[PDB]
Design a protein around this nucleic acid. Structure first.
Ligand code: MG
Ligand code: MG
Ligand code: MG
Ligand code: MG
Ligand code: MG
Ligand code: MG
Ligand code: MG
Ligand code: MG
Ligand code: MG
Ligand code: MG
Ligand code: MG
Ligand code: MG
Ligand code: MG
Ligand code: MG
Ligand code: MG
Ligand code: MG
Ligand code: MG
Ligand code: MG
Ligand code: MG
Ligand code: MG
Ligand code: MG
Ligand code: MG
Ligand code: MG
Ligand code: MG
Ligand code: MG
Ligand code: MG
Ligand code: MG
Ligand code: MG
Ligand code: MG
Ligand code: MG
Ligand code: MG
Ligand code: MG
Ligand code: MG
Ligand code: MG
Ligand code: MG
Ligand code: MG
Ligand code: MG
Ligand code: MG
Ligand code: MG
Ligand code: MG
Ligand code: MG
Ligand code: MG
Ligand code: MG
Ligand code: MG
Ligand code: MG
Ligand code: MG
Ligand code: MG
Ligand code: MG
Ligand code: MG
Ligand code: MG
Ligand code: MG
Ligand code: MG
Ligand code: MG
Ligand code: MG
Ligand code: MG
Ligand code: ZN
Lengths: 174, 59, 211, 142, 38
RNA sequence: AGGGAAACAACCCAGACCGCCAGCUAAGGUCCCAAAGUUGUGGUUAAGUGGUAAACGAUGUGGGAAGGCUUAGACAGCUA
RNA sequence: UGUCGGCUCAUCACAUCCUGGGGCUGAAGCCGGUCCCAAGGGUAUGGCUGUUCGCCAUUUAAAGUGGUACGCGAGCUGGG
RNA sequence: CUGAAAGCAUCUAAGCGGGAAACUUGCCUCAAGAUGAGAUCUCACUGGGAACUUGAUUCCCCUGAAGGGCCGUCGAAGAC
């Protein structure tokens, strides 16, 4: 329960509105993060934020730690949004960003285009790197993972779309 | 058939069949099931007095 | 789909293109249809239009059916048909002609096929006959086995046996319109159309089409 | 002195309305079946129809406990070989909500000509309203 | 993936987890150590 | 023979002289079919287990008696 | 309670032969091996023999395995 | 994917996704005897008297419509 006993340490410029279980965080360059909590959870507003549990059951104990981590991501996101890196390995593989349409040529017969939902923005500083930006961890990591299943990496040469820190297992032909 | 009809009549007065028979044996009453089922249908005001007699036996 | 015309099969013919190929064609005569009733959601549930075509002598139209044809000043015709329309407007007394079709324009033709009275299983279900020699006894075009022993010990529902090659309604899909004769009220269609000559056929836009 | 018997010509019947909006499927149906038969009246005879009329309004909001929402299955055969057909609780609430309560109540009634007259007195709807305001049904708590 | 009735670790990096009521082994080191059932 | 075990000679209860629109019990039972507790108190299970199974496998969960490290800094992470 | 094989007509199981979706590979590609999910639809013609089977010849995406009185003679045959 | 119980890890415990010829529709046909017998448009019929066991009653006279059938000529409809 060491995660549930840690505060959130809310940054300087934010706002916390608590009307019942429904909770929100307000911030800059992106705001309006909302979620509600199961009726088995405690949140104690102060100069900080703290989490407890109504009950002693096992499920209530496990869900207290999820609430602490979920709110923490909400707190960071409005202040410092989360960001994911994708790298492209292989000749003739390149990606270019155009507003809300990301086009990828990944060796198929036909180049494919990915549509970026509201929220996130992608921009490619290079022709082999993708930069996914956003305000929530779950949506940013979902779209990054949706851009990877187009061509997940190969062990023999590493060709495909990979995370910028993902280790790719390699091997050689017999 | 008599039991199923005393059961229906006792619950309108707030008592189950098995709790009624326990109270009736407890107080002294020994009326048949055939006569109890007849009072339940027709002499409802007499059945009510018997039922509240069985409750008053603390059973 | 959802809106078409009612016509009469006139027969088969051919037309020769300029490049020499011959197109097998069925002629369909569509006398202009007359809108008889308009069915909407707030009156009927579903949404459709009702249509009549042809000509009927006054002695064969009954009193109830004549006052229905007189609510909309339409005059009685043979038969009455209903087309379940999607989103269209039609007032009572309107005209519907072949001019809602073009060339190309894959269409579906609905008709009632020819009737073969009481057919055997070879003709109806494409069974194969037993021997014509080699000792076979009075069992040449008969079906054969129709079940198993004690287990089930009954004939299963839907078993294929003989009787009545239907004069039922069938539709042939994705037929190509070759020519539309507005002035003569004709509709030249490539292929074969169910039924005999002079029968009623329903012509509607292609249900599938796509490719 | 002979035991009283109910004549089917002078049987008193009342209308009730019950709200199936969070109630367990099986514990709601046992009480419904008890009223449809007359087991709540002292005039009950096993061969006449002496129960009341029941109206159920919020059919689609009935619930089951445990994992029965996705695992409870409904089967029926069509008469043709390999004609067994299936559906579950989740999909039948979307398709035909009223069939869920009628099926539960129907299996708790006798399977004979009288058990089908008692089933004829049950009206199940999926909204919050019924067309039977002319009969003025009363409120029945479970 | 290897489907057996006796699933168990094969090296240090193997990991016994239970997912939708099924015991599984997931290994970061070798993709050959994946197991199901058991 | 009768009641129970769904139906079910050989299992459980019990041995039919006749009649009764009287009562008490046995085996088995008491949410509806279908007579009788949606009875009371303290726990277990989440598997529809209950309502078919073996070697063997598993951080499923309840209870109990003891151990090894540990503010001279324990166990996991992270930096050499 | 008519017993092998052939013919006609079938129906179900999945322990899947082809087509469909996947994990591992001693998986470079084209091919494969093995395991998992999947029963919608398909799934040879002949020479020899009474043969089921089998062996040959030429095909096919493939020429599945079984239950049904080793399905089927008040449906046929009658080679054994 | 996000994520704890169990500072890590973890597709799951709360929450959110992708995914097959199998399943429900989409295509074609039958279909209110679906006794739960549904709906729409239009058409027809607007007289007396008596007996009562006193209203979903019985009889007498007059009036029988909308329509259906018999009959006849037949049909790419058909054993009847
Ligand atoms: Mg004919
Ligand atoms: Mg042949
Ligand atoms: Mg012969
Ligand atoms: Mg002979
Ligand atoms: Mg002959
Ligand atoms: Mg058949
Ligand atoms: Mg029966
Ligand atoms: Mg196994
Ligand atoms: Mg899953
Ligand atoms: Mg016995
Ligand atoms: Mg038994
Ligand atoms: Mg018995
Ligand atoms: Mg007793
Ligand atoms: Mg006892
Ligand atoms: Mg029975
Ligand atoms: Mg009872
Ligand atoms: Mg209780
Ligand atoms: Mg069970
Ligand atoms: Mg079981
Ligand atoms: Mg079967
Ligand atoms: Mg399988
Ligand atoms: Mg296969
Ligand atoms: Mg396959
Ligand atoms: Mg494959
Ligand atoms: Mg494979
Ligand atoms: Mg199969
Ligand atoms: Mg099949
Ligand atoms: Mg098959
Ligand atoms: Mg399908
Ligand atoms: Mg051969
Ligand atoms: Mg030979
Ligand atoms: Mg055998
Ligand atoms: Mg066999
Ligand atoms: Mg045989
Ligand atoms: Mg066989
Ligand atoms: Mg036979
Ligand atoms: Mg024979
Ligand atoms: Mg034979
Ligand atoms: Mg026979
Ligand atoms: Mg014979
Ligand atoms: Mg014969
Ligand atoms: Mg001979
Ligand atoms: Mg011989
Ligand atoms: Mg985590
Ligand atoms: Mg993870
Ligand atoms: Mg979950
Ligand atoms: Mg989907
Ligand atoms: Mg699909
Ligand atoms: Mg295909
Ligand atoms: Mg199937
Ligand atoms: Mg009808
Ligand atoms: Mg009707
Ligand atoms: Mg007339
Ligand atoms: Mg007529
Ligand atoms: Mg004729
Ligand atoms: Zn391993």
């Amino acid at each position: 329960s060491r995660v549930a006993k840690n505060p959130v340490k809310l940054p300087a410029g934010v706002e916390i509105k608590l009307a019942g279980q429904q909770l929100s965080i307000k911030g800059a360059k992106g705001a309006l993060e909302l979620k509600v909590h199961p009726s088995v959870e405690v949140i104690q507003d102060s100069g900080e934020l703290r989490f407890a549990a109504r009950n002693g059951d096992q499920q209530t104990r496990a869900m207290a730690g999820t609430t602490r981590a979920l709110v923490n991501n909400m707190v960071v996101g409005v202040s410092q949004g989360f960001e994911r890196k994708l790298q492209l390995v292989g000749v003739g593989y390149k990606a270019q960003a155009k507003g809300q349409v990301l086009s990828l040529s990944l060796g198929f017969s036909h180049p494919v285009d990915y549509e970026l939902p509201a929220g996130i923005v992608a921009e490619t500083p290079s022709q082999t790197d993708i930069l996914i930006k956003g305000i929530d961890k779950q949506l940013v990591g979902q779209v990054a993972a949706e851009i990877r299943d187009f061509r997940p990496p190969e062990p023999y040469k590493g060709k495909g779309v990979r995370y910028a820190d993902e280790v790719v297992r390699r091997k050689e032909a017999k | 058939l008599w039991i199923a009809r005393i059961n229906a009549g006792a619950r309108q007065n707030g008592l189950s069949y098995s709790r009624l028979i326990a109270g009736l044996k407890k107080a002294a009453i020994e009326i048949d099931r055939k006569v109890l089922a007849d009072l339940a249908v027709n002499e409802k005001a007499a059945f009510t007095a018997i039922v509240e007699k069985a409750k008053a036996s603390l059973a | 789909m959802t809106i078409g015309v009612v016509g009469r099969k006139c027969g088969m013919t051919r037309i020769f293109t300029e490049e020499g190929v011959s197109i097998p064609v069925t002629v369909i005569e569509v006398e202009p249809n007359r809108v008889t009733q308009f069915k909407t959601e707030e009156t009927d549930g579903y949404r459709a239009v009702q249509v009549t075509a042809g000509e009927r002598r006054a002695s064969r139209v009954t009193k109830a059916q004549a006052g229905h044809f007189a609510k909309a000043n339409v005059a009685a015709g043979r038969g009455v048909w209903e087309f379940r329309l999607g989103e269209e407007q039609y007032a009572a007394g309107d005209q519907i002609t072949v001019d809602l079709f073009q060339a190309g324009q894959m269409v579906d033709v609905t008709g009632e096929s020819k009737g073969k009275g009481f057919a055997g299983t070879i003709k109806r279900w494409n069974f194969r006959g037993q021997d014509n020699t080699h000792g076979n006894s009075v069992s040449h075009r008969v079906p054969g086995s129709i079940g198993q022993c004690q287990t089930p010990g009954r004939v299963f529902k839907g078993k294929k046996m003989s009787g009545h090659l239907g004069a039922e309604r069938v539709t042939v899909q994705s037929l190509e319109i070759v020519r539309v004769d507005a002035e003569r009220n004709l509709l030249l269609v490539k292929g074969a159309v169910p039924g005999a000559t002079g029968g009623d056929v329903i012509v509607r836009p292609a249900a599938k089409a796509r490719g | 002195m002979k035991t009283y018997t109910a004549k089917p010509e002078t049987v008193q019947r009342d209308w009730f309305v019950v709200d199936a909006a969070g109630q367990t499927l099986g514990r709601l149906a046992t009480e419904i079946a008890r009223r449809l038969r007359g087991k709540h009246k002292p005039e009950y005879t096993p061969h006449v129809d002496t129960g009341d009329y029941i109206v159920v309004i919020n059919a689609e909001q009935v619930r089951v406990t445990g994992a029965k929402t996705t695992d409870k299955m409904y089967y029926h055969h069509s008469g043709f070989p390999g004609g067994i057909k299936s559906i579950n609780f989740e999909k039948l609430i979307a398709k035909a909500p009223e069939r869920v309560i009628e099926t539960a109540v129907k299996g708790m009634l006798p399977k004979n000509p009288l058990g089908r007259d008692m089933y004829r007195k049950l009206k199940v709807y999926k909204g919050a309203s019924h067309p039977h305001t002319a009969q003025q049904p009363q409120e029945l708590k479970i | 993936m290897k489907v057996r009735a006796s699933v168990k670790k094969l090296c240090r990096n193997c990991k016994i987890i239970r997912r939708d009521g099924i015991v599984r082994v997931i290994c970061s080191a070798e993709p050959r150590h994946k197991q199901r059932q058991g």
